[PDB]
Each structure stands twice: as C-alpha cells, then as structure tokens.
C-alpha cells in the first residue's frame, strides 16, 4: 500500500482545507484505499439532502485512474444512473498519476453544481437540463428527498 500513504495525508488535508461541499469523509482501516462520504452541492437542491459517493482508489493509483460510484440516485448528466462517472480528472486519456482525491471530489462538486451539457455521460439529462433547468431542479428536489443522503444541518 503505497497509494494509501498519500491518500491518508491528502484526506486529512482535504478535511482541514474545509469539509464543506465534501463532508462525511470516512476511510476504512483495512480498505483505507477506498473512500466514502457525501458531497453537499449548492446549485441543485441541497436543502433536502446530498449525494453519497464512494471513490475506489486502488494501490494501482499511480498506474491507473480511480473509479467513483454514487450510492444515491443521480439526476446529473455527468454521472450515470448506476452512479458511474466519466470526468477528465479520472479519464483514461487524462490519467494523471499526479492527480488525487482533491481533484476527483472537486470535480464531482463542480459538475453536480455546474453540469456541462457539452458531452457528458448522459447527454439526455443534460438536454432536459439545457432546455429547461426547472424540471432538472424540481426532479432533483425530489431525487434528493428520495435517495439523496441527509446532508447535515451544518
């Protein structure tokens, strides 16, 4: 476990930096390579809840990009219905071993706040967004309230 060492300092650093848009950061003792927590967005209806995500960051971190999968249902085009993600931060063509969870997490928050209908995972969800953010917002309000994690009060 070389990766894990870096991931530990980087995690403590993350929380310290200001666990705001990213909270409930936890790491297992044995499987410390894998991360779990939630991300509190601002733009989409976070009042009702948040989005729980899990970042599988193997020992092979400097060999290959990690994967992320949302546990909670999503209505954001940058993620798939099975919670899967495809962002440049962990894209094969942009596999940078210099990247870390700071880049990953801030990506989700960045795309969950401000989604790119340019060419995301589900262009469709981006289409209904780009035609009418109001159904995106209201469907989100409910999606969050169905399966979104309970965001903290602070």
Swiss-Prot record:
One of its GO terms (biological process) is cell population proliferation. It is found in: Nucleus; Cytoplasm. Ubiquitous, with highest expression in testis. One of its GO terms (molecular function) is enzyme binding. It catalyses: S-ubiquitinyl-[E1 ubiquitin-activating enzyme]-L-cysteine + [E2 ubiquitin-conjugating enzyme]-L-cysteine = [E1 ubiquitin-activating enzyme]-L-cysteine + S-ubiquitinyl-[E2 ubiquitin-conjugating enzyme]-L-cysteine. Changing residue 9 to E: Marked decrease in autoubiquitination. Its main location: nucleus. Keywords: Acetylation, ATP-binding, Cytoplasm, Nucleotide-binding, Nucleus, Transcription, Transcription regulation, Transferase, Ubl conjugation, Ubl conjugation pathway. The modification N6-acetyllysine is found at residue 131. The keyword Plastid does not apply. Pathway: Protein modification; protein ubiquitination. GO terms for cellular component: cytoplasm; cytosol; nucleoplasm; nucleus; ubiquitin ligase complex. The active site is at residue 86. SUPFAM superfamilies: UBC-like (SSF54495). Ubiquitinated. The alteration of UBE2L3 protein levels during the S-phase of the cell cycle is due to ubiquitin-dependent proteasomal degradation. Autoubiquitinated in vitro. It is an enzyme of class 2 (transferase). Its EC number is 2.3.2.23. Coiled coil: none annotated. InterPro entries: Ub_conjugating_enzyme (IPR050113), UBQ-conjugat_E2_core (IPR000608), UBQ-conjugating_AS (IPR023313), UBQ-conjugating_enzyme/RWD (IPR016135). Ubiquitin-conjugating enzyme E2 that specifically acts with HECT-type and RBR family E3 ubiquitin-protein ligases. Does not function with most RING-containing E3 ubiquitin-protein ligases because it lacks intrinsic E3-independent reactivity with lysine; in contrast, it has activity with the RBR family E3 enzymes, such as PRKN, RNF31 and ARIH1, that function like RING-HECT hybrids. Accepts ubiquitin from the E1 complex and catalyzes its covalent attachment to other proteins. Mediates ubiquitination by the CUL9-RBX1 complex. In vitro catalyzes 'Lys-11'-linked polyubiquitination. In contrast to other ubiquitin-conjugating enzymes E2, residues essential for lysine reactivity are absent: Pro and a His residues are present instead of an Asp and an Asp residues in positions 88 and 119, respectively. Interacts with PRKN; involved in ubiquitination and degradation of misfolded proteins. Interacts with UBE3A; used by the papilloma virus HPV-16 E6 protein to ubiquitinate p53/TP53. Interacts with CCNB1IP1, CBL, ZAP70, RNF19A, RNF19B and RNF144B. Interacts with ARIH1. Interacts with ARIH2 (via RING-type 1). Interacts with NCOA1; they functionally interact to regulate progesterone receptor transcriptional activity. May interact with NR3C1. Interacts with NDFIP1 (via N-terminus); the interaction mediates recruitment of UBE2L3 to ITCH and causes MAP3K7 ubiquitination. Belongs to the ubiquitin-conjugating enzyme family. This is Ubiquitin-conjugating enzyme E2 L3. It comes from Homo sapiens. The gene is UBE2L3.
């Amino acid at each position: 476990m070389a990766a894990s060492r870096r991931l530990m300092k980087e995690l403590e650093e993350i929380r310290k930096c200001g666990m705001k848009n990213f909270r409930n950061i936890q790491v297992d003792e044995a499987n410390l390579l894998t991360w779990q927590g939630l991300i509190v967005p601002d733009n989409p209806p976070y009042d009702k809840g948040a989005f729980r995500i899990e970042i599988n960051f193997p020992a092979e971190y400097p060999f290959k990009p990690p994967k992320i999968t949302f546990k909670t249902k999503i209505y954001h085009p940058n993620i798939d219905e099975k919670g899967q993600v495809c962002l440049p931060v962990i894209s094969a063509e942009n596999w940078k071993p210099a990247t870390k969870t700071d880049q990953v997490i801030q990506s989700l928050i960045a795309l969950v706040n401000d989604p790119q209908p340019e060419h995301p995972l589900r262009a469709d969800l981006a289409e209904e967004y780009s035609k009418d953010r109001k159904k995106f917002c209201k469907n989100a309000e409910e999606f969050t309230k169905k399966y979104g994690e309970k965001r903290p009060v602070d």
